[model samples]
Target: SQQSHSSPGEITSSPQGLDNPALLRDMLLANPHELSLLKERNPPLAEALLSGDLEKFSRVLVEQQQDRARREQERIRLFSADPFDLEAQAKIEEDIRQ
Candidate 1:
């Protein structure tokens, strides 16, 4: 008898639809296109993903996105104020753009 085996871990052909398994296991990023960018932006998040603790990983990502939302609201506060308002204007200038 002759027998042949394919390595379970070896992935020769990739599927176009529902490719989440490879994304989840191979690099642990939400999107493969931005893996490096995401890694650089939040190294701790990458660490959390690598440690196999998805609970902490999800929580950390949620908190960071929430933080950005708050800052965006702050920008709205400035946008609503008068241009000559030095106090709020200073904050607008000090904060980030581009």
Candidate 2:
């Protein structure tokens, strides 16, 4: 499973405050469309589903996903060429763990 780094009031107050599930619910309740649209830009909305924006929770997520994907792609690309560099595969696995 994934880890949670948010508090309770963040959603209730500023983006830096605690993570208020109430606000999250409100946002979803008030503007379900906004929730979907904002997920790309809104941290909390994205949080609702765990991740997407990279960076979602941090300056990470998508960047991390892309990085991992690149590593995997690179591994695949070089799999036939070298089939020896397990570093990319390791890095990709580590990224998923993070």
Candidate 3:
């Protein structure tokens, strides 16, 4: 018999782009380190996960990630200005340091 072409990626007894939020949330319950690390900054992340919308939670998380990238892009533009521009240089360093 030939093997199926589709890949079997879910790894139990351990752990990807997995959609098994059913199994996933309990996995989160087991991980207080990651839980607090993620939840502390974004409480809605914990709320959404427990409320049965982890699919959307992940989507929203990624959306925010993209939005953060947009912010980073703007940050990069400020860095692109002349290094001798004291105002720009100082502002860039201050913003990133914080």
Candidate 4:
């Protein structure tokens, strides 16, 4: 088996592209693509970032910086503690038979 490698362009797309917290934070603040990419990678992190809840985001990022093990721990930690219900039911007046 062979390992795949990323190109220079992919490396600079977002801070996550290179595992740089400082660059990630800056990109997250100013780049929609970076934010969306993160959202796709980790929903909880994205929610926190999007909601201007930088405290959690910062903590998680720091944990990630410590190590991949710490990153998974932090991911589970933050993910399980999420307060919002992304799957909340929508209000409906009526339903039609199909």
What local lDDT does model 2 show for residue 14?
24
- Residues 1-98 of candidate 3 have per-residue lDDT tens digits of 87533323322212221333444465666778766765787676677665657676676556655776788788867753322222221111123665
lDDT value for candidate 3? 0.53
lDDT against the true structure, per candidate, is 0.50, 0.43, 0.53, 0.57
Candidate 2 residues lying further than 4 Å off, grouped into runs, are 1-19, 42-98
TM-scores of the candidates in the order shown: 0.41, 0.23, 0.40, 0.41
Name the lDDT of candidate 1.
Answer: 0.50
Q: Rank the candidates by lDDT, best first.
A: 4, 3, 1, 2
Off by over 4 Å in 3: 1-27, 75-98
User: How many steric overlaps are in each model, in order?
Assistant: 0, 10, 0, 0
Poorest lDDT segment (10 consecutive residues) of candidate 3: 84-93
Residue 49 lDDT in candidate 2: 42
The C-alpha local distance difference test score for the whole of candidate 4 amounts to: 0.57
Write the number of the candidate with greater lDDT, choosing between 1 and 3.
3
lDDT of 2 by residue, 1-98 (tens): 98544333222222321233333444454676766765677555467445433223344333444565777777767643322222222111123665
> Which model is ahead, 1 or 2, in terms of lDDT?
1
- Choose 1 or 2, whichever is better by TM-score: 1
Screening candidate 3 with a backbone cut-off below 3 angstroms (N, C-alpha, C), the clashing residue pairs are: none
For model 1 the local lDDT of residue 21 reads 30
- lDDT for residue 71 in candidate 3, whole number 0-100: 86
